[PDB]
Scaffold this motif. Structure first.
Motif, mmCIF file in Angstrom:
data_model
loop_
_atom_site.group_PDB
_atom_site.id
_atom_site.type_symbol
_atom_site.label_atom_id
_atom_site.label_comp_id
_atom_site.label_asym_id
_atom_site.label_seq_id
_atom_site.Cartn_x
_atom_site.Cartn_y
_atom_site.Cartn_z
ATOM 1 N N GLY A 173 0.837 -1.170 0.000
ATOM 2 C CA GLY A 173 0.000 0.000 0.000
ATOM 3 C C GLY A 173 0.877 1.227 0.000
ATOM 4 O O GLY A 173 2.062 1.134 0.288
ATOM 5 N N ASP A 174 0.273 2.368 -0.316
ATOM 6 C CA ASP A 174 0.949 3.655 -0.368
ATOM 7 C C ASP A 174 1.896 3.740 -1.551
ATOM 8 O O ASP A 174 2.914 4.445 -1.487
ATOM 9 C CB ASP A 174 1.739 3.919 0.929
ATOM 10 C CG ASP A 174 0.881 3.832 2.189
ATOM 11 O OD1 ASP A 174 -0.317 3.431 2.118
ATOM 12 O OD2 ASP A 174 1.435 4.171 3.268
ATOM 13 N N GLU A 175 1.576 3.041 -2.631
ATOM 14 C CA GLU A 175 2.435 3.043 -3.831
ATOM 15 C C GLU A 175 2.310 4.351 -4.677
ATOM 16 O O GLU A 175 3.208 4.688 -5.473
ATOM 17 C CB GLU A 175 2.145 1.797 -4.697
ATOM 18 C CG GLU A 175 2.488 0.389 -4.035
ATOM 19 C CD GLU A 175 1.361 -0.175 -3.144
ATOM 20 O OE1 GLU A 175 0.420 0.600 -2.905
ATOM 21 O OE2 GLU A 175 1.414 -1.360 -2.690
ATOM 22 N N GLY A 176 1.208 5.083 -4.487
ATOM 23 C CA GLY A 176 0.985 6.301 -5.242
ATOM 24 C C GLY A 176 -0.031 6.168 -6.368
ATOM 25 O O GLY A 176 0.114 6.826 -7.410
ATOM 26 N N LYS A 177 -1.071 5.356 -6.156
ATOM 27 C CA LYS A 177 -2.135 5.100 -7.149
ATOM 28 C C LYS A 177 -3.010 6.309 -7.575
ATOM 29 O O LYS A 177 -3.426 6.408 -8.745
ATOM 30 C CB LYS A 177 -3.092 4.029 -6.620
ATOM 31 C CG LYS A 177 -2.465 2.705 -6.300
ATOM 32 C CD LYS A 177 -3.562 1.695 -5.970
ATOM 33 C CE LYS A 177 -3.952 1.779 -4.490
ATOM 34 N NZ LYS A 177 -5.433 1.803 -4.322
ATOM 35 N N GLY A 178 -3.346 7.181 -6.633
ATOM 36 C CA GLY A 178 -4.208 8.313 -6.934
ATOM 37 C C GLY A 178 -4.030 8.992 -8.271
ATOM 38 O O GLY A 178 -4.937 9.106 -9.076
ATOM 39 N N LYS A 179 -2.814 9.406 -8.543
ATOM 40 C CA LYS A 179 -2.519 10.123 -9.771
ATOM 41 C C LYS A 179 -2.774 9.303 -10.986
ATOM 42 O O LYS A 179 -3.327 9.797 -11.941
ATOM 43 C CB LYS A 179 -1.079 10.626 -9.768
ATOM 44 C CG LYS A 179 -0.764 11.407 -10.985
ATOM 45 C CD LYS A 179 0.692 11.323 -11.267
ATOM 46 C CE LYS A 179 0.938 11.790 -12.689
ATOM 47 N NZ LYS A 179 2.327 12.305 -12.833
ATOM 48 N N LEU B 17 10.119 7.852 -8.376
ATOM 49 C CA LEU B 17 11.500 7.555 -8.746
ATOM 50 C C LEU B 17 12.372 8.743 -8.405
ATOM 51 O O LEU B 17 13.546 8.592 -8.074
ATOM 52 C CB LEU B 17 11.631 7.288 -10.263
ATOM 53 C CG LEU B 17 13.087 6.968 -10.618
ATOM 54 C CD1 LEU B 17 13.401 5.498 -10.283
ATOM 55 C CD2 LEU B 17 13.369 7.319 -12.073
ATOM 56 N N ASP B 18 11.763 9.926 -8.492
ATOM 57 C CA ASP B 18 12.424 11.196 -8.225
ATOM 58 C C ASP B 18 12.885 11.324 -6.781
ATOM 59 O O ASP B 18 13.800 12.065 -6.503
ATOM 60 C CB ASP B 18 11.514 12.376 -8.619
ATOM 61 C CG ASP B 18 10.330 12.534 -7.713
ATOM 62 O OD1 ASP B 18 10.521 13.192 -6.664
ATOM 63 O OD2 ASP B 18 9.216 12.021 -8.034
ATOM 64 N N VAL B 19 12.268 10.596 -5.862
ATOM 65 C CA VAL B 19 12.673 10.664 -4.469
ATOM 66 C C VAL B 19 14.125 10.185 -4.322
ATOM 67 O O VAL B 19 14.800 10.516 -3.352
ATOM 68 C CB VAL B 19 11.697 9.836 -3.549
ATOM 69 C CG1 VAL B 19 12.191 9.796 -2.104
ATOM 70 C CG2 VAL B 19 10.249 10.387 -3.645
HETATM 71 N N1 LIG Z 1 7.684 13.457 -5.630
HETATM 72 C C1 LIG Z 1 6.653 12.686 -5.996
HETATM 73 N N2 LIG Z 1 5.474 12.661 -5.313
HETATM 74 C C2 LIG Z 1 4.487 11.833 -5.830
HETATM 75 C C3 LIG Z 1 4.636 11.035 -6.958
HETATM 76 N N3 LIG Z 1 3.469 10.303 -7.230
HETATM 77 C C4 LIG Z 1 2.687 10.702 -6.252
HETATM 78 N N4 LIG Z 1 3.168 11.605 -5.356
HETATM 79 C C5 LIG Z 1 2.575 11.886 -4.134
HETATM 80 O O1 LIG Z 1 2.152 10.592 -3.762
HETATM 81 C C6 LIG Z 1 1.349 10.630 -2.610
HETATM 82 C C7 LIG Z 1 0.536 9.360 -2.477
HETATM 83 O O2 LIG Z 1 -0.567 9.282 -3.428
HETATM 84 P P1 LIG Z 1 -2.031 8.620 -3.216
HETATM 85 O O3 LIG Z 1 -2.385 8.370 -4.639
HETATM 86 O O4 LIG Z 1 -2.811 9.611 -2.422
HETATM 87 O O5 LIG Z 1 -2.079 7.248 -2.322
HETATM 88 P P2 LIG Z 1 -2.245 5.686 -2.731
HETATM 89 O O6 LIG Z 1 -0.903 5.060 -2.860
HETATM 90 O O7 LIG Z 1 -3.115 5.708 -3.914
HETATM 91 C C8 LIG Z 1 -3.272 4.702 -1.639
HETATM 92 P P3 LIG Z 1 -3.100 3.773 -0.100
HETATM 93 O O8 LIG Z 1 -2.369 4.688 0.812
HETATM 94 O O9 LIG Z 1 -4.526 3.541 0.256
HETATM 95 O O10 LIG Z 1 -2.341 2.527 -0.421
HETATM 96 C C9 LIG Z 1 0.439 11.787 -2.877
HETATM 97 O O11 LIG Z 1 0.191 12.451 -1.618
HETATM 98 C C10 LIG Z 1 1.160 12.525 -3.976
HETATM 99 O O12 LIG Z 1 1.165 13.845 -3.433
HETATM 100 C C11 LIG Z 1 5.861 11.040 -7.674
HETATM 101 O O13 LIG Z 1 6.153 10.356 -8.652
HETATM 102 N N5 LIG Z 1 6.807 11.905 -7.131
#
Ligand SMILES: Nc1nc2c(ncn2[C@@H]2O[C@H](COP(=O)(O)OP(=O)(O)CP(=O)(O)O)[C@@H](O)[C@H]2O)c(=O)[nH]1
Ligand SMILES: Nc1nc2c(ncn2[C@@H]2O[C@H](COP(=O)(O)OP(=O)(O)CP(=O)(O)O)[C@@H](O)[C@H]2O)c(=O)[nH]1
Lengths: 431, 431
Positions: free
Chosen positions: B12-18, B332-334
């Motif tokens: 979890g918290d992989e960044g799916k939202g976007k 990846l940018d992190v």
């Molecule tokens: N620097 C950077 N930040 C990113 C990138 N992709 C997403 N973010 C940040 O990622 C964070 C996590 O995204 P989010 O889509 O909310 O959570 P999730 O992983 O879908 C879901 P869960 O936590 O339920 O597993 C966001 O708060 C967004 O601001 C990226 O490639 N680079």
């Protein structure tokens, strides 16, 4: 294909047992992926008649391997009985069977919860009738149950049992007013068989992917019928588990996408047991016929099994829940010496509408009346026929509508309770 | 493909939202298939920023229908608060949203069970359980709970409720020593949202069967990460439902054979919230570096999330459990500004055997030592990079190596939270 799923498309009694053993000759591995000890697959080995409920059907095959997967709730108690059977009858079961670590375990307290439930809740209504399959499933979900895995660490196994056993004992005695279950006895019992189970343990989803990687033939067997699937079925009259093809990934750990073929078994007429919606049931004579001519009685205190015409509207539901690849039509023989045959092709609702999709398990099925499509009968005997050249024009005509109506074809046709009585037009494993 | 499934390959918290917001611009249908009011997705609702926990972000779109599939536990209380929230903002929620009838209901007594279960089986240091998601699933499987479909028979909800509630106050007050939930209140509150919830119900399975036959772009979305799967996860440390792709057939009503492309979101590195095996967790500066730049704070009373390098052994299990089609690498940018970087390629077992497959929750994780490959890193920032070419050779080596160790192509790369900061190499839909 190599990964083939087999299962009934109605409410059970599809006559799955014959095709199973039949497909078990070309498959290397066999897997049970859902439910528990209620598979109901009868066989014969040592000149004596034996019925399996847990062990997969392939245990007889010498160069086959049968696996019980993560989706099956386990009962050492019932495994030792079936093994002891075949071992006595001379079958190397220990060198032919393997189970998941992830299998949830049913223990006496789990049967007790059930026994105490129906009696109480209502001994005439559907509680759950003894084997604790539901409690095993419930404990799992809640994250308090035990698995085969745990048996590896005895020290820990003893402590956990006590934590679970007390919560249950409490509600048994206190809520239900039933005698409690002695933790020491369950303990003694399971330890006595520990190393047996632990020794059959294997990494199933790995072995399965590994099996896919090399092209081995695998057959997945569902034990019960689709229309009783805890979720999608004719609720509330349903069974403890999911009974559809979709439970295969969950049940064994194989991906959705490696499901190549899905064979849905199909009886030429319908039967149901216990209450529950049944739109095409027959009330008087043809009903009697379809029963008398097909051996529709008992099999386990089964007072009597209801019968009626093939409902295409629900079969269609099954086609969609399973993404069925093809059918296996059974008992077309019962239909011989019949004036005609009806096929249900739509319902009439209580509000007066005509609908081609199964009503939501929230609308009165008791209200729906079936729009039958009648078709000429056939007096010729289909029983035994081993090619379609001997199938009458009327028999082939009944097939086509089922095909035209369901939108899935019939690859295997069965003409009798015996192996030889079969017509393999396609065969799942080469398709 | 055409039936696309999107989900977390890690914890979890992989960044799916976007990614999801992005794909919903291409999808004619969006489907939730497992979970509850977990979701957690920040939508800048045209000016105002809002956190949706149940309704799909796909609700903000003028031509997309959102479906709460039957595998999701339903909370009226929760969904009404989200409706008005968006309806206040001007979004016709009530006309783009469809609920399945099979969806179990979450109600007062499920949360107050959760809240007692935590007290006793927990301790002071943030007890974040109170939701009622575990409980409701516990009632479903034990054919003892209510569904949305039940609301279609007001006189019957009244009785079935008093029963399931009778059973629950006995636990609340006699076992847990907590209080009882009042029945007339729960009956009353629910009845006041009934006609609304039943006015959005639809035959999901058919609807989807129609769109697929018809060829529309349907997207499915997982809420929790893969290795939290009630079944193939780290047992103790797993959630209440099935997070993998197989939960698709089951929580929506669309057989296994109709999932087209299964996109798994991978994070440039791994993180963990809470207890459980994390064989690559970092306790040094690099961890602090990763947590810091990644903003791996729990976005609320967020006790710092555990950190570490990416684990190809763990990631491979994910691939195998969902038959992954391609990856989507995030954050990846992190890693910009790191002299060198590592990845786990094998696990060293205590008896020396180096292996490429996770311990089957049993012959433990706790004992495993990780085996790495240390490759140089980059300095030149990669934030916002829009083309494959503009990436350093070190960052490119890295991607290609994940691809090798796993055998699945990274088809989408994210280089920033905004949407233009994305690289589509394959595009799941037209693939
Ligand atoms: N620097 C950077 N930040 C990113 C990138 N992709 C997403 N973010 C940040 O990622 C964070 C996590 O995204 P989010 O889509 O909310 O959570 P999730 O992983 O879908 C879901 P869960 O936590 O339920 O597993 C966001 O708060 C967004 O601001 C990226 O490639 N680079
Ligand atoms: N006349 C006739 N009998 C058949 C045919 N195929 C199978 N049978 C018989 O009908 C019965 C079918 O049920 P069985 O073979 O036990 O499988 P099943 O009933 O699906 C399994 P369970 O009921 O436990 O789920 C058997 O007793 C078998 O000999 C057929 O084509 N015609």
């Amino acid at each position: 294909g190599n990964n083939v799923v087999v299962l009934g498309t109605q409410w059970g009694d599809e006559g799955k047992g014959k095709i199973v053993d039949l497909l078990t000759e070309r498959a290397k591995y066999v897997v049970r992926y859902q439910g528990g000890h209620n598979a109901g697959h009868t066989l014969v080995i040592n000149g004596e008649k034996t019925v399996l409920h847990l062990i997969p059907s392939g245990i007889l095959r010498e160069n086959v391997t049968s696996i019980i997967g993560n989706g099956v709730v386990l009962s050492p108690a019932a495994l030792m009985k079936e093994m002891k059977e075949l071992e006595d009858r001379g079958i190397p079961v220990r060198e032919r069977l393997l189970l998941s670590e992830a299998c949830p375990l049913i223990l006496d307290y789990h049967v007790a919860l059930d026994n105490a439930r129906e009696k109480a809740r209502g001994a005439k209504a559907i509680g759950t009738t003894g084997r604790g399959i539901g409690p095993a499933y419930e404990d799992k979900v809640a994250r308090r149950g035990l698995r085969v895995g745990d048996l590896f660490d005895k020290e820990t196994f003893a402590e956990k049992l006590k934590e679970v056993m007390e919560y249950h004992n409490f509600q048994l005695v206190n809520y239900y007013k039933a005698e409690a279950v002695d933790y020491q006895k369950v303990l003694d019992d399971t330890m006595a068989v520990a190393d047996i189970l632990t020794s059959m343990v294997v990494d199933v989803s790995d072995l399965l992917d590994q099996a896919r990687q090399r092209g081995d033939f695998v057959m997945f067997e569902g034990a019960q019928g689709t229309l009783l699937d805890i979720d999608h079925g004719t609720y509330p009259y349903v069974t403890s588990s999911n009974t559809t093809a979709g439970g295969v990934a969950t049940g064994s750990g194989l991906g959705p996408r490696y499901v190549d073929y899905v064979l849905g078994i199909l009886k030429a007429y319908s039967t149901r047991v216990g209450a529950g919606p049944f739109p095409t049931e027959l009330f008087d004579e043809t009903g009697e016929f379809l029963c008398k001519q097909g051996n529709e009685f008992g099999a386990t205190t089964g007072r009597r099994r209801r019968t009626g015409w093939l409902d295409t509207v629900a079969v269609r539901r099954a086609v969609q829940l399973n993404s069925l690849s093809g059918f296996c039509l059974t008992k077309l023989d019962v239909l011989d010496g019949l004036k005609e045959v009806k096929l249900c092709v739509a319902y009439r609702m209580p509000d007066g509408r005509e609908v081609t999709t199964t009503p939501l398990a929230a609308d009165d099925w008791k209200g729906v009346e079936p729009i039958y499509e009648t078709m000429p009968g056939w007096s010729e005997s289909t029983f035994g026929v081993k090619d379609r050249s001997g199938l009458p024009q009327a028999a082939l005509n009944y097939i086509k509508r089922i095909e035209e109506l369901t939108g899935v074809p019939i690859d295997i046709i069965s003409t009798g309770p015996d192996r030889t009585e079969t017509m393999i037009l396609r065969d799942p494993f080469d398709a």
